[PDB]
Structure formats: structure tokens, C-alpha cells
Amino acid sequence: DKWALYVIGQYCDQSVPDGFGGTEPRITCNAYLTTQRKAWDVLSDFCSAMRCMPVWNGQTLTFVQDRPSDKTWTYNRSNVVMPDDGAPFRYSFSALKDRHNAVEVNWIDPNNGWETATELVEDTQAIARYGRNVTKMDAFGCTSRGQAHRAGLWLIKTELLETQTVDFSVGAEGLRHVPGDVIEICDDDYAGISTGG
Amino acid sequence: NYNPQTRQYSGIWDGTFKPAYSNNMAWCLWDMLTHPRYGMGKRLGAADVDKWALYVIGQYCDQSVPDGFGGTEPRITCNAYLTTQRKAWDVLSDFCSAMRCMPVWNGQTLTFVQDRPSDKTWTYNRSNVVMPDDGAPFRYSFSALKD
Amino acid sequence: AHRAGLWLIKTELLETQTVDFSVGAEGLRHVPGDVIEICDDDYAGISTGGRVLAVNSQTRTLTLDREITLPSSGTALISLVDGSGNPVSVEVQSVTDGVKVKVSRVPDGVAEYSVWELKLPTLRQRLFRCVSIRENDDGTYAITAVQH
Amino acid sequence: MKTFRWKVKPGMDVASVPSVRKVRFGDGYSQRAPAGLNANLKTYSVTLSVPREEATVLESFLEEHGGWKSFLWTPPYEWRQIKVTCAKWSSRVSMLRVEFSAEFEQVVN
Amino acid sequence: MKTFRWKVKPGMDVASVPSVRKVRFGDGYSQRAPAGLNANLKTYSVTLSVPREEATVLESFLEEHGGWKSFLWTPPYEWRQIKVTCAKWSSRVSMLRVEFSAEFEQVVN
Amino acid sequence: MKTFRWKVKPGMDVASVPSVRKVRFGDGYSQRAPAGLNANLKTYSVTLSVPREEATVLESFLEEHGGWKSFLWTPPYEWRQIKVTCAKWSSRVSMLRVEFSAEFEQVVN
Amino acid sequence: MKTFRWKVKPGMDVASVPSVRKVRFGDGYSQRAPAGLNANLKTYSVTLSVPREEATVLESFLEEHGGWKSFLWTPPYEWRQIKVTCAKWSSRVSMLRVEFSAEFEQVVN
Amino acid sequence: MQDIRQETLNECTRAEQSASVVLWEIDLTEVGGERYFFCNEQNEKGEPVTWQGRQYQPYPIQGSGFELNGKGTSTRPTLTVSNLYGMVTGMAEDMQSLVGGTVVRRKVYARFLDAVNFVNGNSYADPEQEVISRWRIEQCSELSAVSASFVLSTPTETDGAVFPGRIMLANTCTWTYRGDECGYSGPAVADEYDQPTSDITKDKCSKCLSGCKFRNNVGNFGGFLSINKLSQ
Amino acid sequence: VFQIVLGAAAIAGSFFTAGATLAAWGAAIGAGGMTGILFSLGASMVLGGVAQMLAPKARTPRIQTTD
Amino acid sequence: AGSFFTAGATLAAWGAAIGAGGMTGILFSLGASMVLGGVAQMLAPKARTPRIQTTD
Amino acid sequence: QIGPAALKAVYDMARKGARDEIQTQMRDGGLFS
Amino acid sequence: QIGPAALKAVYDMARKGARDEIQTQMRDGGLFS
Amino acid sequence: QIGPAALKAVYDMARKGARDEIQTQMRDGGLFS
Numbered sequence A: 001d002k003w004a005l006y007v008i009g010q011y012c013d014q015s016v017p018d019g020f021g022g023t024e025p026r027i028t029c030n031a032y033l034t035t036q037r038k039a040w041d042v043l044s045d046f047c048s049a050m051r052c053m054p055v056w057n058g059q060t061l062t063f064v065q066d067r068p069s070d071k072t073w074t075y076n077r078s079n080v081v082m083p084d085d086g087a088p089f090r091y092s093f094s095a096l097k098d099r100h101n102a103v104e105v106n107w108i109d110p111n112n113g114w115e116t117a118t119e120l121v122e123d124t125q126a127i128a129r130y131g132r133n134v135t136k137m138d139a140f141g142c143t144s145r146g147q148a149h150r151a152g153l154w155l156i157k158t159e160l161l162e163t164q165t166v167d168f169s170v171g172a173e174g175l176r177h178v179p180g181d182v183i184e185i186c187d188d189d190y191a192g193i194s195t196g197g
Numbered sequence B: 001n002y003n004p005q006t007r008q009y010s011g012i013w014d015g016t017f018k019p020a021y022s023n024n025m026a027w028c029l030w031d032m033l034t035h036p037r038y039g040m041g042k043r044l045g046a047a048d049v050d051k052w053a054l055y056v057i058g059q060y061c062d063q064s065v066p067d068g069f070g071g072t073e074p075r076i077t078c079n080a081y082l083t084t085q086r087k088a089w090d091v092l093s094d095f096c097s098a099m100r101c102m103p104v105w106n107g108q109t110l111t112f113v114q115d116r117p118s119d120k121t122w123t124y125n126r127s128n129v130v131m132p133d134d135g136a137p138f139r140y141s142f143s144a145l146k147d
Numbered sequence C: 001a002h003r004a005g006l007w008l009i010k011t012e013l014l015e016t017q018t019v020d021f022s023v024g025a026e027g028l029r030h031v032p033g034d035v036i037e038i039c040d041d042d043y044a045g046i047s048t049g050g051r052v053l054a055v056n057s058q059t060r061t062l063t064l065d066r067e068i069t070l071p072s073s074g075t076a077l078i079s080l081v082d083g084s085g086n087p088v089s090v091e092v093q094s095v096t097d098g099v100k101v102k103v104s105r106v107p108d109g110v111a112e113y114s115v116w117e118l119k120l121p122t123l124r125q126r127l128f129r130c131v132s133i134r135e136n137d138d139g140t141y142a143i144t145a146v147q148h
Numbered sequence D, E, F, G: 001m002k003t004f005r006w007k008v009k010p011g012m013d014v015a016s017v018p019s020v021r022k023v024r025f026g027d028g029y030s031q032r033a034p035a036g037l038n039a040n041l042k043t044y045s046v047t048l049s050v051p052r053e054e055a056t057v058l059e060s061f062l063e064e065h066g067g068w069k070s071f072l073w074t075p076p077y078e079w080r081q082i083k084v085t086c087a088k089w090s091s092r093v094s095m096l097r098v099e100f101s102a103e104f105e106q107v108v109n
Numbered sequence H: 001m002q003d004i005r006q007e008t009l010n011e012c013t014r015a016e017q018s019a020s021v022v023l024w025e026i027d028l029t030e031v032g033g034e035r036y037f038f039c040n041e042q043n044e045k046g047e048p049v050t051w052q053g054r055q056y057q058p059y060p061i062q063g064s065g066f067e068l069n070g071k072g073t074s075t076r077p078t079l080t081v082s083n084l085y086g087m088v089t090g091m092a093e094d095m096q097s098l099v100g101g102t103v104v105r106r107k108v109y110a111r112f113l114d115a116v117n118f119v120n121g122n123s124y125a126d127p128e129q130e131v132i133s134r135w136r137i138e139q140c141s142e143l144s145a146v147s148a149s150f151v152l153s154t155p156t157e158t159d160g161a162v163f164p165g166r167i168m169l170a171n172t173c174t175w176t177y178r179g180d181e182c183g184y185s186g187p188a189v190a191d192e193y194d195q196p197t198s199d200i201t202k203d204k205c206s207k208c209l210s211g212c213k214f215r216n217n218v219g220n221f222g223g224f225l226s227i228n229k230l231s232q
Numbered sequence I: 001v002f003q004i005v006l007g008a009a010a011i012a013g014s015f016f017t018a019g020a021t022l023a024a025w026g027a028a029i030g031a032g033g034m035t036g037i038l039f040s041l042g043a044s045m046v047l048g049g050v051a052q053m054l055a056p057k058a059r060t061p062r063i064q065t066t067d
Numbered sequence J: 001a002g003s004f005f006t007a008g009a010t011l012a013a014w015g016a017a018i019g020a021g022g023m024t025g026i027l028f029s030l031g032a033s034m035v036l037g038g039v040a041q042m043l044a045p046k047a048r049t050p051r052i053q054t055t056d
Numbered sequence K, L, M: 001q002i003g004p005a006a007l008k009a010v011y012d013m014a015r016k017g018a019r020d021e022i023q024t025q026m027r028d029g030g031l032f033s
């Protein structure tokens, strides 16, 4: 899908605070691939540097970039399949230790010398809550401190904010859905009231 | 009540740790488990690891054994220099393999089962165990030839 | 280093077999790494354990299920549980018809259908150390153990 | 409503089946415990027979509870009022009468 | 058409089996909730006896609806018009008459 | 109490089904051993018919024992006192009498 | 004891079921072998009926073997003495008689 | 051998024993919540079970996977509870899905329960007879309109931990602000963006060298301000 | 007549498989049109972390002691 | 390992009764599985060693 | 229970069990599958 | 369905499912099992 | 065979199959799972 990559590039070209008082494009290249890795490895590196995920749409290979998107449809308990147990919407949560609060991002500094510098990103508020879970990551195209910090902060913020998941198998309308479609769920059981029918 | 220089315990311990330099590998493991700065003291913490099990483990590791050069030597000793960041399980397993113990969550504390000559605690016959459909109250198995 | 290698080799050569013998409600007493003796009458050629049917404190004697045979040489011992759950041990003096035994002293509080064991002078104890205890959501505990 | 008023004609079936915890030891020895903490619930396989007009009232009463919810009933077995729930209440229609079959499960709730 | 216009035999079964959310582990405490909104939709086991000539009309109706396509029906149980579907409707063709055995599961949509 | 003191109906079933260790592969050689020490403990399917008033006493006895708590019983089979437990004891309540259908599994402890 | 003496009244059921090795080839062809080496064993579904006093003797005799062990018996089918084992011997009690049902399995042991 | 009293040992060996009840306690005090007490059963008087003077409310709850093993993975139990009427849901939206909470499980023979629970009273009531176990909540695995399921773990669980932990860095501080290693106790100076503030609620070190200088704490800086050039 | 859809409590102990009791499905054995054992992918798909459901988490070269 | 002794006990009572809530089936005794790596692994965790590098 | 419908259900349960097991063996001790 | 013959068949189907899943996980994304 | 009790038994047999199959794939040729 060339249009998905078009919108992805427009998103990656946006100007953001540099951290040194200036501005910088959101995500940038400057990789030097020298060792023959599998195509999946390089594709995953590219799709992790910018927060997208490749999915076979059905006609083209699309990319689902993690962007603030609007609601596409709304599902209540009158629009989804009911199994034997009264659970139209099943929910699940991420584990305590899978909510990381400290990240070490390895980027390559072009200023000191073209060597690997480690940038530490922390969320001290979350460290007071979920203990202290640390990870290491390689920002694939990063050569600017701001981009490495942004990657680490995106990981930390996603882990801290986005917590739960839902399985809500639906009827015949499900053919309208491509992965990466934002949908509102109006579950009267989750709420204390009734808000759909 | 433990003097690391002579490696001799005085009497009953009653807790109350003391800041002294020792080669006792059991308390090296104790430091690894319950140190807040670099170890695992933030998670876990004290009152979660059985200190008396480590006390008996250290007493066992401090016993004198033939050196092989005509002298004597403590049974098990430290002098490791950990430089590369391995997972906490890796270091814990290394410590619990150097002295022949095995960490198990007792239910209130994390105990260590040292391979020591111990005494019988209970006795079980076929009149005290569950009988399945097949008449095998006690099933047995053996280690392989190549193991 | 030699001691570590030798401990590995000796453990592999000596400790060979393991046992699974899921037990009743008493399994809550067991922590992993507890040494326990197993008196299996099928593994042996004789019977060396059972339950106590009746106790007669005067002319001190016990009634035991199965049949017990005393050894030609030495003396045998019989282990009973007293009234405080303490496993006392007594010396067997004479067994009449393999069901009625006469011992030196009947411990106080020995109730009927309590567990009795026999210790012959020429029998190995066959100790095993526990490695895993599983609650079976039933009241029975599944215990795995290895030779000691 | 709260109280079951209709009468059960032919002779109901009363099932107790208390839940126990049982362990089977070796040579004939065992271990038994009551498993639960309170009583035994007991269930009544019950049959009604009512005119073709009262059947609508009976079905409406059994539907207003709808499987959940408990109604009072005095069984003609021990003559002590208990709380029961009904979840099946099958019904067979005839020319002048309707015959109901139901399973009243006694609940502490 | 949209209305079953035949007359059923006396003996007809009406099962209810409401759908509720029930939580209970072992023999301990129990909790019951009424699950959905449209309670119980019952099930009418129905039998008909027709002359050998109108069997064609009845089966043409049933096969035209064909499992889907609910139709309007007034059961002689509560005499209130409802919407039902049929999925099996086996038949037994005697020397002079035919006996239909069908099921009606009432619906909402 | 500790002694079932009621009289059973003529028709009563006594299943034995002893427990043995049997080893055999395919149709080849077979080996049989007596397994446990306390042989077979049998099972008595028992039926009683008592008036509608003594039903309460009988059921109170059975429910007080409640699956566990074996009691003493003298079956008219061998006329030898044994210890048994009951776990089901369903009941059918006729107009003037009631019929208990219970099982007695002989025990040792 | 060794020999079964009580008589079998109603007409037993004699089951052969020899075990064979069978391979089904393609277009209707096959391959068959006797699997075992020594004949077929055959089993007898047998029913006794004995006075209420001899039932204790019959039960004691059948218990002394206890599922395992083999006793001699001469079936009234081929009139040749064989060795059998019995492992069920259910018994139903009546007013003046007891009726036993059993499955005698012939064994080479 | 567990530190369990002799009365429990006497009760374990009996042929006919009383029912073994399991009482659960959820403790969210360390994460910002209260303590809840649950038992799968009521007592003979239709009231929540009174044990050691504490009332455990009736609620469907049952655990599994409880075992004591050393070889292999650390054992992960599981606790299934009823989510009718949206109680657990309310906790999950409130207490970060109960993650980090403490589950305490007590096994008690019914014979030793307090005399309140029985109509006739209890002569053998002994509030010291119990077997206790502690676990932590790792993940609310399922939460539907019917029930909820929680994964438990031993409080040790050295899964995501590493050793040694302290990391060598330049232009960043690895200490905890105002912690013992940081050793700072001064008044509010600036926020994480080095903007000067006098507000105590907006006082946080930027973890850079300038943030340390703002508090005159450069002696306590957790970084190493030479290693960036030696690694080239 | 329904969709069962196994969750996470059913696969963790025989607890809620008897909650819905699967009576209609069990007595009906199955059907060609509808499929059983759907196995909702809630907990399994989130094991590595939420951020792994949105980005592929590029890897890093193996550490060599020689450096 | 083969449908050999599943028909030994014949599982007739359990099969006809399917089971019960209180008691659990399929226990799968941990005899052989726990001892596959060796007895010495059942008592000590068997510390590992660093990967061999040809560069040295 | 008919063979056709039961065999696929057993196969899918087996696949799900293998998933759960492979994921649980990458835990601390485990075997890393 | 008799228990003896059913348990071996279920075990063998479980083994086949484990084979299929382990081999599936050695694909691109997977888990490399 | 009731569905509730059978599904858990099938799941546990499948997990045991995963045990056995992974452990036997860590043998000489195998796949090292």
C-alpha cells in the first residue's frame, strides 16, 4: 500500500521539539545495513522504528501506524455474538511485569563519535506503582538524542496507558473491518447503566 | 555472633545482622537477593527470604574438609567477580548450584533446600496413600543410562 | 572444584530412583526437601505396615491386620502413633498368630485404626527426599520424591 | 410475587445427594469429610396439572422469576417453607388441561 | 404468506429453559443474574394431522420459509400472536392422512 | 444415632465387584493378584416404604449422617453387622406412603 | 474349595469372540490370521437361584476366590470340566430365595 | 515441615474429618486500596463466616494451581472469582486491575472455627489453627460480565530482574530523586524541564547535569561525566 | 445452538466449562456451519506486552565478549 | 506409552461417571519427566557457562 | 460423540495447549522450549 | 466412548498438534518455539 | 461424555503431550523445539 506509506512519511516528517531548543523531524533514517539478515528482521526493524505493523489487507500489504485515530464503528451487546456464558465482551489485561517503566535505547551519536550511546528513559511515577521493569531497545534509524528518547518514551507511555484488550466476536458485518480500525465498545455490563439497544 | 576471620559462630543468632566482610557464599547470595541499590532489594525485600535456612547453609559451607595438599579448607567459598549483566535467575541458579541447594517458595518465605544428610520425617505405607484404579499406590521411575 | 565434580558424580551414581505416591489430607505437613521413609509391602517380599485394629493396655498387646513374622536373629521394633500424634517406638516381644502382638509398652492414647509400622534389624530404611508437592483440589496431595 | 400456591398431584421425586470429600486409601481404608460447611440443598422433581386457563397464570408466575430469583414454597414432604428456584418448567397441552413438569432447586438465597 | 393458518393436535409441548448467568464453584455460594433482556423464547413441539392433499400446501409453506424467514403464529397456549421459525418438520404419510412433527422456536427479529 | 433401624423391602440388590490387580496384553498370558487386603466391600441397593410421617425421621437420620459418618447396619443377607455409608437416597412421595431408594457402600474405617 | 457345584437354571449365554488379526486391502481383498496361539476361551453369562440360606454359602465360596483365582466347573453346554474365574456375582434378594447373576470367564490358568 | 500446630495434625489423621474451609484476603493497601475478605460459603446461620473475630463475606471464589516445587518455572496459581454485579470490574478500573496486590489464603478446619458460626457453639474453637500462604497478583487474565480470573505469583518471581542492576551512563543520573543515594533535601528549585519553580509539587530533577547543578548536587551525580569520549 | 468460545477461566481448571455447562453444544456434538473451540486471543496475544501488539520490537546484535 | 494399561485398570467407573468437581483426573505423575535431565538437576540448578568464542 | 466433529476439536485443543506450553516454558526456569 | 482407548488417541492427537505447532512457530514471526 | 469435564481433561492431556514432545525434540536429531 503506497498510500499508507505516504501518510506514514507525512507523519514522520512532522516537526517536534529537539530537546536542545530547536526542532527536528519526528522519525529519520541514516542506517547502514552491512550484514545479511532475514528480510523479516529488516522489515520488523523498519516497522518498529516508526510505530506501525504490516498486515496483508487482502489486496495489498498495508501498515497500521500507531496514530490517534477516530472511532469507525460502535458495538454494544445487542450487536455481538452471545456464547453460552453471558460474556459478549471478554476482557484481558497486561501483566504487572510486562508494564515496563525504564528503557535503555541504543542510538548512534554523530557528534562525539559514530559510536553507540545509551539513552535512559524513565517514568518515575510508574516506578512508584509497578515496581521497576527495565528493557533494552535499539532505535533502528536513530542518530539524534531526541528520536531515541521519543522511541523509549513511546514504549513507556504505551505500556503505562494502554492496558486492556477485548474479544467480542461479531456478526456478518465483520467483513468491514481491517486490522488497525478504532471502534467504540458500549458494554452495559462494564458500565452501571444501559446505553445501547 | 559470626566472626568471618575465624569462621566460627558463637551461639544462638536471633537475627540482628552486622556489617562485616566475609567470604561466606550463603551471605553473598543473601546480599544478592536483598540489596536495594543494585541487587533485588527493591522487589522481594527482607522477610521474604528464609534467613535461618541461609544461616544453616553458611554453617555447612564453613565446615573444614581435607584440602588435598595435606591441609584443610572451608567446604564452599566465594571469590566471584560478576561483570556482565545476566538475568537474576541465572545468578541465583549459579549461587544455588555452587552450594547444593534449591530455592523453593515455602508459602511465607523463599526457602533453600540444601542437599544435606537429613533424618526421616514421616513414614508412608500402602495403608496411608491414595490407591488409584490400578493397584499402584507407589509409582517408581529411574534415571536413564546416559544420564 | 574436585568436590563439586565428585558430588555430581556420586549423586548420579548413588541416587537412582524416584517415587510418586499421592497422599491423603496430611500432605499439608510437607515442605519440599523433607526426607520420608516408604514402607511398601509390594517392593519388599513381606508385610511391614498396616493399621491397628484394637489395643489392650493391660497384658499389653495390639491387634494388627495382615500377618507379621518376627526375624530369627536380633529384635524387631514396632512404630505406633500415640495420642498426641507423636510416632513412638516400642520393642516387639512376641506375636502369637500374626495378628496379636505383645510389646514392651503400649504408648498412651494409641487409638484404633492408627498406623503401625515394623522395623526389622536387616531392612534398609529406603528414604526419599521430596521435590514437588501438588494440591489436587480434592484433599489429596501429589508428592514426588527421589532416593536419599 | 413470592409464594408458590399451586399444588403438586402425583408424587414428586426428592433428591438429596450431599457433596462430600472422599479419599480412598489402600487396603480398604478411607477418609471422609462433609466438603461443604452447611446442610444439603435437596431438589424436587415436581409436576402440576391445571386447567387450560390457569396455565397462563402459572407460566407468567414462573416467567417473572425467569430461571434466576427465588420464590417461597412449602413442599408436601417436610412441611417447612423453603426458598426455591425453577429453571425448566416444561409444559404439555391437552384439550382441557395443561400438565407442567419442573425442577425446584432449594437455595439458601 | 406470513401466518401459519393450520390447527395443531391436542398434545403439544412447550419448553421454556430461560437463559441466565449463574456463578457457582463446588457447593459454595451461588449468584444468579437474568443475563439478557428478552428472557426466555420457549420452544413449541407441535404436531399436525392433515389430509393427504393439503400436505403439499403445508410443506410448500414450510419449505418456502426454509428455516429462516420467521412467520406469525397464534399458539393456543396464551393466544397471543408471536413470531416463530421452524427447522425440522418431519412428516409421516399414512394411508389417508399425514402427520407433521415440527418445532417452533419463537424469535424477536 | 449409629444404627439404621428400619426394615427394607424384599427386592434388594447386592453387587460385589472385587478389586484385583489384573495384567494381560492382547489375548496372551494373564496374571491375577488380590490387590488390597480388605477384598470386596460390596454395595447394597436398598429400597424402603414408610408412611408419610416416618419419612421425616428417616430423612433426618440420613441427612444428619450426610454422606460421611458411616453407621452400623445388619443386612438381612448375611445377618452380620457391618458399617455402611449412604450418598444418594432419593425419595418418591406417594399419597399415603413414601419410598426411599438408597445405596449402602460398606466401609472399614 | 475348587469345584463349583451349584446348578444354573434358565439358559446361560455363551460368548466366543475369538481374537483375530485382520487387514483390509483395497478392492474387496483382505488378509486374516488367528492372532493368538491357543484356541478361544469362551465366557458364560450364568444365573443361579438358591434358597435364602444357601446364598451365604454361595457368596462365601465366590468371595474366597475374590475375582482372581480359578475354580473348576463343568458347564451344561459341552460337558467338559474347565477352569473359570468370576468377578461380578451380583445378587438380588427376595422373600424366600436369592437370585445370583455372574460372568464366568474360562482361563487356561 | 510446615509450622503447623498439633491439633491440625490430629485432625488430618482422622478417618472422618470436618470440612476444610479456605478463606481469602485481598490486600491492596500497598497499591492504594483496602482489604477485602472472602469465603465461598456462608455458615449455618446464613451469615458471613466469622474467623478469629473477622467476618469473611460470602462470595464465589476458588483457587487452583497451588503447589510447592523448585525445579522448573516458579509456580503460578490462579484465582477465579465472580464478576456478577460488576464488583471486580469496579476494582479493575480503580486499582490498575489489582496488579501488585497481595492475596492471602488460609486453610482452616471447620471444627476450629469460632463458636459464632454454629448454632450450638464450638467447644473446639481454636483461633490459632490455620495454614497461611501469601501470593501476589501478576495479571487479571480474564474479566467478563460473568467472572474474573487472576494469575498469582510467588512474591520473589525473579522474572524480569537482572543482576547487577546499576548502569554506567553519561549525561544522565540513575539515582532516585531525593533518595538516599541522591541525598538531596533542599527546597523546590525546578521541574523535569529545568524550568525554575518554587512549587513543591512541581519539583523533580531533570536527571541531566544541569538539573543536578540547579540543586548544587553535582557531587552526588549518578552519572560518569567522562565515559562518553572513552567509548569512541 | 450457541458459540461456546473458550475463555481463560475454562482453560485454567474445570471451573467455567461447567459454568455455561456446554449442555446444548455437548449434546449436539457440533455442526458443519458453526465451529467450536474458538479460544479467544486476549491473554495470549498480550503476553510480551501491549507495545508488542503495535510495533514489531526490532532486535539487537548478539553481545560479544571480545569487544 | 501405548494403550496398554489404560485398559489395565479399564477406567470403567471413571469413564462411566465422567468425573466430578471435587476430584481431578489426568494427574500425570512427574516421575520420568522430572528426572530426564539427571538426578543432580533435581537438587541443584546446574549453573551455566559462557558461550565459547573462536576469537580466543 | 461423533468422530468427525470430535477429532478436530481435540486437535484444536491440542494446538492451544501447545501454544500455552511453549509460552510458559520461556519463563524463568522453564526450558525456553 | 471407553476411557482406555480414548485417552491414547487423545494423547497421540496432542503429540501431533505439538509437532504441527512447533513447526509452525519456526516460521518468520512465530516464536521459534 | 459431558463437555465441561471432558474439555479440561483434553487440555491437560494436550499440555502433557507438549511436555513429552518438546523434551523428545531436545534429543539428538529432533528440532531442539
Ligand code: SF4
Pocket (backbone or CB within 6 Å): H173, H174, H175, H176, H177, H178, H181, H182, H183, H184, H205, H206, H207, H208, H209, H211, H212, H215, H217, H218, H220, H221, H222
Ligand atoms: S541529578 Fe543530582 S539532584 Fe537529580 S536525582 Fe541525580 S543526584 Fe539527585
